[PDB]
Design a protein around this ligand. Structure first.
Ligand SMILES: [Ca+2]
Ligand code: NA
Length: 259
């Protein structure tokens, strides 16, 4: 079941974007799929530019890997950066030039909730180390939906909060001692936040852990390879128990092992 991260496998490339619009992006599957979607449904957002609204949806993995989308959704408001997730039928994304998270229900194309993440920096205040306006990073783990951010009161250290997926209320918050701008990205596995040291290196590491159950911080040295030298997005999927990442045009996955 659950445990501490102990190993990350080699990146596997599933699709490569063919234009610069996909240099950065987010791709994802739903770890709690709901009708009409399934555990194979995949979403892809190419996130370069200033008016990002198109969300590509694929019914089957084979379509994601080789074909055109099954459907394209046009979001009612432009999206910011690479932090979005899908969870239990909704895309959760940050509005451009805002600290607002939006719940967009995919089957009805309806905005169901919006919430300012209180005190969160946005638009280049507390990005990860590559920039990209990556101030606010949503995450799904075994327990549900979270948000990773920082605030002036936390002096740029990573803050994580559990979110109610229905109405986006913050349920509980934890403050780490990890400077968000000093790490390439982060993700949560089994209630532990992990960070990646570098977005360019073939020889990066998963370098810090913060366990929300115990409050304990640790250092780690688990190898992590950025095959294409520019990882813009690194998230965990708790149904597949894999990392999903976006690395310089390439949509990649990594296997992991937990103790
Ligand atoms: Ca992430
Ligand atoms: Na995310």
């Amino acid at each position: 079941g659950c445990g501490e991260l102990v190993w990350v496998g080699e990146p596997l490339t599933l699709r490569t974007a063919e234009t610069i619009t996909g240099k950065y992006g987010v791709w994802m599957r739903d770890p709690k799929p709901t009708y009409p979607y399934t555990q194979e449904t995949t979403w892809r957002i190419d996130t370069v530019g200033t008016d990002v609204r198109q969300v590509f949806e694929y019914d089957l993995i084979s379509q994601f890997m080789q074909g055109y989308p099954s459907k394209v959704h046009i979001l009612p408001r432009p999206l910011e950066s690479t932090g979005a997730v899908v969870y239990s039928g909704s895309l959760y994304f940050q509005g451009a030039e805002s600290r607002t998270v939006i719940r967009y229900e995919l089957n009805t194309e309806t905005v169901k909730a919006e919430k300012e993440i209180p005190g969160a920096g946005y638009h280049g205040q507390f990005p990860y180390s590559w920039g990209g306006y990556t101030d606010i990073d949503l995450a799904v783990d075994e327990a549900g939906l979270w948000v990773i951010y920082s605030t002036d009161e936390a002096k740029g250290a990573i803050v994580l909060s559990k979110l109610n997926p229905e109405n986006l209320e913050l349920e509980q918050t934890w403050e780490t001692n990890i400077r968000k701008q000093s790490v390439a990205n982060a993700f949560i596995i089994c209630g532990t936040l992990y960070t990646v040291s570098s977005y360019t290196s073939a020889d990066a590491t998963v370098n810090f852990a913060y366990d929300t159950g115990t409050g304990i911080s640790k250092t780690l040295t688990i190898p992590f390879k950025n095959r294409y030298k520019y990882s813009s997005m690194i998230d965990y999927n708790p149904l597949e128990k894999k990392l999903f990442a976006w690395d310089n045009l390439n949509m990649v996955t990594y296997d992991i092992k937990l103790s």
